[PDB]
Amino acid sequence: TVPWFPRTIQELDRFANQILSYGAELDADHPGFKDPVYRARRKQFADIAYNYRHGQPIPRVEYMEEEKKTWGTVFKTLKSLYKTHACYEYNHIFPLLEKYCGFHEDNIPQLEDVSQFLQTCTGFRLRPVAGLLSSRDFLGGLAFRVFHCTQYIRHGSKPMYTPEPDICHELLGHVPLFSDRSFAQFSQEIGLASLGAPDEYIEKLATIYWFTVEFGLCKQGDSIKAYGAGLLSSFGELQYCLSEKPKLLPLELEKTAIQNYTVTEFQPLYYVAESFNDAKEKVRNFAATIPRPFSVRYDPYTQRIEVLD
Amino acid sequence: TVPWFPRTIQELDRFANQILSYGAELDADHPGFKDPVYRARRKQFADIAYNYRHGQPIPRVEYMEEEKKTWGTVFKTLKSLYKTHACYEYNHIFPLLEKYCGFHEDNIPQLEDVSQFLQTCTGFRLRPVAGLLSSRDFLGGLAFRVFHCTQYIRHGSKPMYTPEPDICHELLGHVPLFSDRSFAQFSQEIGLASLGAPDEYIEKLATIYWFTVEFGLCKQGDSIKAYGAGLLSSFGELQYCLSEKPKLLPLELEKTAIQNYTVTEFQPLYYVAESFNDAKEKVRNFAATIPRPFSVRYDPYTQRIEVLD
Ligand SMILES: C[C@H](O)[C@H](O)[C@H]1CNc2nc(N)[nH]c(=O)c2N1
Ligand SMILES: C[C@H](O)[C@H](O)[C@H]1CNc2nc(N)[nH]c(=O)c2N1
Ligand SMILES: N[C@@H](Cc1cccs1)C(=O)O
Ligand SMILES: N[C@@H](Cc1cccs1)C(=O)O
Numbered sequence: 093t094v095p096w097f098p099r100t101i102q103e104l105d106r107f108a109n110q111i112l113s114y115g116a117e118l119d120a121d122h123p124g125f126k127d128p129v130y131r132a133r134r135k136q137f138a139d140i141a142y143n144y145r146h147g148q149p150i151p152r153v154e155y156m157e158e159e160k161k162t163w164g165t166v167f168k169t170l171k172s173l174y175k176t177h178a179c180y181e182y183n184h185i186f187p188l189l190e191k192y193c194g195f196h197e198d199n200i201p202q203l204e205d206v207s208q209f210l211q212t213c214t215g216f217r218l219r220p221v222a223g224l225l226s227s228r229d230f231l232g233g234l235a236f237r238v239f240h241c242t243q244y245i246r247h248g249s250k251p252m253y254t255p256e257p258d259i260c261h262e263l264l265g266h267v268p269l270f271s272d273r274s275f276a277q278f279s280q281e282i283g284l285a286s287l288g289a290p291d292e293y294i295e296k297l298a299t300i301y302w303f304t305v306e307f308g309l310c311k312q313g314d315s316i317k318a319y320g321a322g323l324l325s326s327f328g329e330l331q332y333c334l335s336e337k338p339k340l341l342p343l344e345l346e347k348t349a350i351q352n353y354t355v356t357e358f359q360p361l362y363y364v365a366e367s368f369n370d371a372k373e374k375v376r377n378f379a380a381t382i383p384r385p386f387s388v389r390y391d392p393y394t395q396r397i398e399v400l401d
Numbered sequence: 402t403v404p405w406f407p408r409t410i411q412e413l414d415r416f417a418n419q420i421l422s423y424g425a426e427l428d429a430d431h432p433g434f435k436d437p438v439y440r441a442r443r444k445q446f447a448d449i450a451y452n453y454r455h456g457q458p459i460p461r462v463e464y465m466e467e468e469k470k471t472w473g474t475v476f477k478t479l480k481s482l483y484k485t486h487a488c489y490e491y492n493h494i495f496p497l498l499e500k501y502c503g504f505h506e507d508n509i510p511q512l513e514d515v516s517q518f519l520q521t522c523t524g525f526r527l528r529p530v531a532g533l534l535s536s537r538d539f540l541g542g543l544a545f546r547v548f549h550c551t552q553y554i555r556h557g558s559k560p561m562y563t564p565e566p567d568i569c570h571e572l573l574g575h576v577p578l579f580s581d582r583s584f585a586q587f588s589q590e591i592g593l594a595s596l597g598a599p600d601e602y603i604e605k606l607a608t609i610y611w612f613t614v615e616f617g618l619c620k621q622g623d624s625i626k627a628y629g630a631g632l633l634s635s636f637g638e639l640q641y642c643l644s645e646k647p648k649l650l651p652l653e654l655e656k657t658a659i660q661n662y663t664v665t666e667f668q669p670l671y672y673v674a675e676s677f678n679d680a681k682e683k684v685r686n687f688a689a690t691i692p693r694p695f696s697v698r699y700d701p702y703t704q705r706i707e708v709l710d
């Protein structure tokens with residue numbers, strides 16, 4: 093039988109409050125969680141996402157000095173690294189976000205403003221969530237050009253890296269490429285292919301997604317650049333990914349798909365795509381092979397899924 | 402040279418206040434205009450359309466007893482006539498408007514509510530206008546699935562017919578079919594083909610549009626039905642169009658396009674299409690022949706026109 097999947101953009105709210113985590117709460121290496129004050133702060137952002145409903149404007153928040161300081165350190169350090177570490181596509185867009193989306197070190201962008209901006213670029217919109225969603229739900233959202241985004245920020249004691257998708261990751265790692273026409277169409281396409289697919293294919297798609305969209309590397313000309321959202325939001329792992337420490341292998345879905353990866357530490361291995369474009373094509377081609385007893389058609393005017401066959 | 406045309410949905414506001422008329426103001430047969438109280442009332446609706454801007458919610462209005470009485474007479478009389486005079490497609494949709502869009506004789510629907518409804522059906526939205534727009538501007542709007550709609554109602558002394566596109570015409574004549582998926586795509590398609598086209602083709606398209614979408618007749622089975630918006634909002638002309646008075650000829654674009662028509666009286670001649678579907682196909686096929694030094698592509702996610710070639 094086919095698992096239930098959203099057919100309308102409003103139906104996304106059904107799983108909006110089903111949050112997970114990478115299981116680092118009990119990690120002595122990430123004391124952030126244990127922080128009682130930080131926990132209460134996190135609870136506030138969670139309540140906003142829980143009470144939020146489709147179509148409503150994303151509530152604006154006033155960040156604390158510790159949080160603004162963290163964003164400042166993260167933003168400034170990454171902007172410096174992008175010049176020599178980020179792929180061409182990313183660097184060509186980033187300037188636009190800074191000028192038309194308020195991306196600056198002395199100001200944490202409000203999701204409502206970012207969402208309005210994205211809508212004008214590619215039709216993508218933000219949907220605040222309490223935290224990490226399952227791969228099926230996240231991918232399913234992309235089918236409607238909806239990016240479930242967190243609003244809280246990583247603990248200030250370790251800005252260099254966090255084993256959770258905080259606002260820095262969502263905005264500096266994902267948002268930029270979601271504002272790109274081609275990447276946006278690519279994203280929606282894989283999301284559409286995931287709707288109602290068996291979990292063994294969802295998890296396989298998730299692993300491929302992990303080694304490309306999240307932590308992929310690609311060569312442009314005779315150099316190697318990072319294009320994975322997870323690398324672009326971690327100045328700690330961004331430095332490491334192009335260093336002599338990690339192991340590098342050519343992108344090959346057949347092998348990449350069955351490869352294991354870590355979710356609480358820097359990746360010990362990365363896959364290098366022949367180019368940013370080839371990465372998109374490979375992932376796109378694999379998603380199209382995902383079997384299901386039907387076909388789907390998205391109507392952008394009504395924002396509804398049409399199940400055929 | 403190519404005439405200027407909107408490339409964004411916001412750019413539509415450029416010509417929103419360029420109003421025209423069918424020149425009946427000096428008509429002794431339409432004393433409505435001359436009415437000073439009616440004129441002041443009309444001025445109120447005009448100011449709302451003038452100050453209105455893209456994206457804003459359409460202002461709600463409280464109608465006068467004379468106006469509500471007029472809507473009641475028009476609605477009730479037409480609903481009775483539709484049973485035997487309107488085409489199948491129209492009658493299948495009308496019930497939905499009554500149940501989910503508040504279409505009743507004791508209540509003039511607010512455009513904001515109608516627009517929200519249309520958006521869920523086919524992505525069409527309403528844009529309040531002070532009155533009649535040029536064919537180029539009206540058609541251009543359809544390219545963005547935008548229907549420039551009036552908010553005022555015809556003078557109460559003659560509910561049976563009016564030589565102007567009042568709210569009864571917009572809501573009972575146009576809205577129903579704009580809520581139909583196929584008709585909506587058809588409408589946007591002709592609008593896209595009209596963008597930046599030479600006026601000799603625009604006026605020809607307008608004449609064809611007049612004898613089909615506005616006053617077309619079509620046979621379904623062994624009977625003849627009306628599907629033209631202008632017939633479906635005039636209980637006076639709706640009775641006449643299927644009577645022995647008017648002249649009827651088969652729909653033939655080559656002849657229909659060069660045919661003359663009246664704009665202040667019942668049509669002396671109507672064209673009968675082989676079927677409602679054949680009418681759409683014929684008009685669709687003609688619009689595709691409209692020559693221009695470029696091609697257009699509409700991006701529904703960004704609501705922008707892309708000029709190619
Ligand atoms: C699809 C893949 O699992 C990817 O890592 C997803 C999972 N869930 C997520 N959930 C939220 N809120 N934000 C993200 O960036 C992600 N990443
Ligand atoms: C396209 C053709 O000219 C058609 O009669 C248009 C013209 N302008 C219009 N303008 C407004 N506001 N409403 C209409 O229904 C129309 N009809
Ligand atoms: N480790 C990333 C965050 C995430 C990457 C992948 C999922 S969450 C960072 O520090 O920004
Ligand atoms: N004569 C129509 C109105 C219009 C038809 C075509 C343009 S305006 C009616 O009385 O409702």
Ligand SMILES: [Fe+2]
Nearest residue numbers: 257306321322
């Ligand atoms: Fe991510």
Ligand SMILES: [Fe+2]
Nearest residue numbers: 566615630631
């Ligand atoms: Fe009309």
